[PDB]
DNA sequence: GCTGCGAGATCCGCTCCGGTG
DNA sequence: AAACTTGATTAGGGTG
DNA sequence: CACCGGAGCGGATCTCGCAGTCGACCACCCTAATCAAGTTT
DNA sequence: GCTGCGAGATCCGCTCCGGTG
């Protein structure tokens, strides 16, 4: 989606949004329009598969909840202890039901035990222990164990085992309840990872970085070429790179660029 | 009908009228009639604040639902510049609830009196609900630190206004490429329909009904309420199981 | 799509509930303590929770012929199907997937402390990193069905409104009084088609003359 | 019926808005609105999937 | 074909603007009191007479990239291409042209009275005497891609049928689906000749890749 | 005819039949492959 | 590089229901 | 001796 | 031999003139010319 | 005791004559 991506950072230095506006809007990959962002000094001066993890004390049973970041969607399981080693068990498995590319959580010891980061490492998460500072993430995670506990406290009595009600929380919340015009946060994830593959089919090409010359052409004459410079977005019959002069994603056709290997 | 279908889901598992509505494709005040009669769990609804920037008092709304808001710069929080202001507020909508806070200009009787003669619920007392206090001030602080990007970029303060507005109410989205408009315009469809469909037509009757096993009639039931009357068939509570069914009206006696 | 089979497999003295996917072949392990219905149940509402079936094959089994099982396969609203499973399109998949399943758990599993991060294991490398055809994973399937699902979802609702405009067109000359009303057949940019009642004539209908309307 | 001329025009603006109605019994408010909801891009372009022939 | 590319070359304090055709290899070179915009506008007006370009290359030098000099270009309605010498396929050409030049020109100046004519001498050995293939010469190569570019082979063409095809791509064996359909441009042995549409790229496509479709009846 | 790789020149190759012209480029039969290419005119020498 | 349709009173073409030689 | 150049402020023409 | 095309005539449809005969004033946007002050050769 | 009609240019339909497989 050339065409799409200069236009969204057009729109996005006079409008300045998420990336997300932008990605879903202008139908482009997103990652160009978090750079977008990154590259928006504006929504830089002021401020997907992302997570936090915190362990939650139900009722004397300790639940380790993955809450995401942006779909508001979530996991959780009941754990036996705070311990780094059931820990790296819960996160391998839940490695296997997601593919998580980065994670928030607190201090606390199971994140900061030094072979469960080894493990994020061995795993290829970008894992952030801190005190979570962030209203954005950390309004929807208490609120997230909020809902949890009193769904919990609706559901538990109706089922015989605390696991199976447990599960009907994340029913309820991640599948049930919706919002908008039916989104429950799992959609909106599965819609983030399908959004997610068909970049990434592109992203191959993408992470093994080109330079190429390129120029552009008025009323056709084309004007001299310009760059080096990244070849930014592979298109069909074009790419995407940045004008260094206007701070601009630009669509340059493949014959008004020459590829530097 | 889907409406008591869903509310045979809800006295189970008890979503969110939310969920109800958008799972069950029944009509949110229905989903909302739900909600608040299911005993477990026990639109066009909003809030206004005043407030300053840059020493402009600044009318708010915020719709508690949808989040979708408006709002318009104001010469002072009065009475009757507001009350004008709700004038036009109602015009650009069709509102039928609010919340506020007890400050002169919204307690103000010619403008709640205004309210009913809009026939509107208005709610004054100190907003205790996290739900929409929240989503309040994060309107807030969100707005004028979007002013504080965009109004350098203005002749206009209020064309700025606009834009802060704009990038709220539209060019922000969440969910699927959800701005809070679209959201606005789904519900507002569905409950226009549902309003037109079912509120205008006929309220607070009783009948008589039956229920078919395999084809043969039960006896006569009741008497209970028609809670929602539909084409061809009905809403009702059948008091022994606590939960909502669609009737016939072939199979209804309506008592007058 | 979202069509599953279950089958209880022995690991090394480990049971371990096998949900295998029909189509996209994406597969869900978890480590049992035992094969009772109950344990079941947690594991079904659980993985429930994590997938989000239409339906299911399964062996006559106890769990999944227990009667609470099956209660909570309609309470959570599935398609259950117990018998003697005969399908070869499916007992091939399944019967790989336990073959491939064991394999590379025996792969897998020295490299792990515990056994359920190393049967985690197994599930990323066919989940995930296990790639085909043209280079797409199961995960990449079913998350493609899953919303494959949802579009079917919306372009129905949208083909169920069939709405009619007021139209002004032809009948001697230049611009008539409106006319209509007469559904949307086909949205164009800037046009549509309708159909002409007198005539029983479609027509092409620049939308500088068309008034949309819902017909109720 | 007002102290403004200006909440008149509020209501002359809600009125014809919404309050004349006819055919069917619905405002222009209807109109716009539900033709918002069929102005959508994503059934709107969800539609592809289905299929295509050519024709002479 | 047409499709020319420039650059100036000083031979013992003479500027000589070598023309160079990219394909043919034939060219055109002349000495030149300076590398200026408005004496390289005069030159190109001759050439220009000379020849019919559609197209061409050059460097970025200050006569070329010159705005009158690009509006010279549109006047005649010449495609003009200025760069970063990026290319070693016309950049070979070009190289071994100046090269050569300068070899020719070291052979035929003691044995004329002037450089032009000696320079003539040179454009005469390489574009009438030198002879390769057959015993073509590059003019005769240019002659003869001119003489093989005329509109009344557009005739022909514009007189045949065309038939249509739906076609795909295979990746690693993989096969693509069906697409398009389009048109055949070309009817080949085992293949045919197609756009991508998605691409705007000629393709040639196996014919059992393609599926011939039926005409009406 | 000649192609490249990575931008970098092949030898000229050919001679091989002059079958399809385009624009901008034009169609031979590869004689190694057995298969058709297409070729920028610049690429190209006719004869 | 653009186009008179809309608000306001009247009246014929039809149907549904009631009265009766 | 002469010339050449720039910031604000008034005279005409086209739309409500 | 039925369907379609071309030329001529009839029926239907949209816009405007006769109501005397036409021109000032306010406000905003766009285009153009001259005085006071500052340079050189 | 007084009331809007007619001229201009298009657009569609009907009739007579001629061509097509």
Same mark, same amino acid.
């Given at each position: 989606?050339?065409?799409?991506?200069?236009?969204?950072?057009?729109?996005?230095?006079?409008?300045?949004?998420?990336?997300?506006?932008?990605?879903?809007?202008?139908?482009?990959?997103?990652?160009?329009?978090?750079?977008?962002?990154?590259?928006?000094?504006?929504?830089?001066?002021?401020?997907?598969?992302?997570?936090?993890?915190?362990?939650?004390?139900?009722?004397?049973?300790?639940?380790?909840?993955?809450?995401?970041?942006?779909?508001?969607?979530?996991?959780?399981?009941?754990?036996?202890?705070?311990?780094?080693?059931?820990?790296?068990?819960?996160?391998?498995?839940?490695?296997?039901?997601?593919?998580?590319?980065?994670?928030?959580?607190?201090?606390?010891?199971?994140?900061?035990?030094?072979?469960?980061?080894?493990?994020?490492?061995?795993?290829?998460?970008?894992?952030?222990?801190?005190?979570?500072?962030?209203?954005?993430?950390?309004?929807?995670?208490?609120?997230?164990?909020?809902?949890?506990?009193?769904?919990?406290?609706? +559901?538990?009595?109706?089922?015989? $085992?605390?696991?199976?009600?447990?599960? &009907? #929380?994340?029913?309820? @919340?991640? %599948?049930?309840? *919706?919002?908008?015009?039916?989104?429950?946060?799992?959609?909106?994830?599965?819609?983030?990872?399908?959004?997610?593959?068909?970049?990434?089919?592109?992203?191959?090409?993408?992470?093994?970085?080109?330079?190429?010359?390129?120029?552009?052409?008025?009323?056709?004459?084309?004007?001299?070429?310009?760059?080096?410079?990244?070849? +930014?977005?592979?298109?069909?019959? $074009?790419?995407?790179?940045?004008?260094? &002069? #206007?701070?601009?994603? @630009?669509? %340059?056709?493949? *014959?008004?660029?020459?590829?530097?290997?």
């Amino acid at each position: 989606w050339i065409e799409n991506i200069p236009l969204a950072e057009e729109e996005h230095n006079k409008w300045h949004q998420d990336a997300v506006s932008l990605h879903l809007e202008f139908g482009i990959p997103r990652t160009a329009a978090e750079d977008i962002v990154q590259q928006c000094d504006v929504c830089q001066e002021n401020k997907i598969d992302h997570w936090q993890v915190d362990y939650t004390h139900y009722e004397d049973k300790i639940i380790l909840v993955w809450v995401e970041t942006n779909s508001g969607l979530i996991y959780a399981e009941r754990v036996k202890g705070e311990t780094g080693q059931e820990f790296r068990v819960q996160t391998m498995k839940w490695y296997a039901m997601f593919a998580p590319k980065s994670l928030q959580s607190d201090n606390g010891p199971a994140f900061v035990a030094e072979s469960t980061q080894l493990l994020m490492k061995y795993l290829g998460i970008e894992h952030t222990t801190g005190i979570p500072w962030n209203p954005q993430s950390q309004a929807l995670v208490e609120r997230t164990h909020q809902t949890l506990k009193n769904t919990l406290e609706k +559901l538990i009595p109706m089922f015989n $085992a605390f696991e199976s009600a447990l599960a &009907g #929380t994340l029913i309820t @919340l991640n %599948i049930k309840r *919706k919002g908008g015009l039916g989104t429950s946060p799992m959609d909106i994830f599965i819609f983030n990872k399908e959004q997610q593959r068909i970049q990434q089919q592109s992203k191959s090409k993408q992470e093994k970085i080109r330079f190429c010359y390129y120029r552009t052409r008025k009323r056709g004459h084309p004007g001299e070429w310009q760059g080096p410079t990244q070849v +930014l977005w592979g298109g069909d019959g $074009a790419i995407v790179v940045k004008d260094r &002069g #206007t701070d601009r994603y @630009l669509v %340059i056709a493949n *014959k008004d660029v020459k590829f530097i290997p």
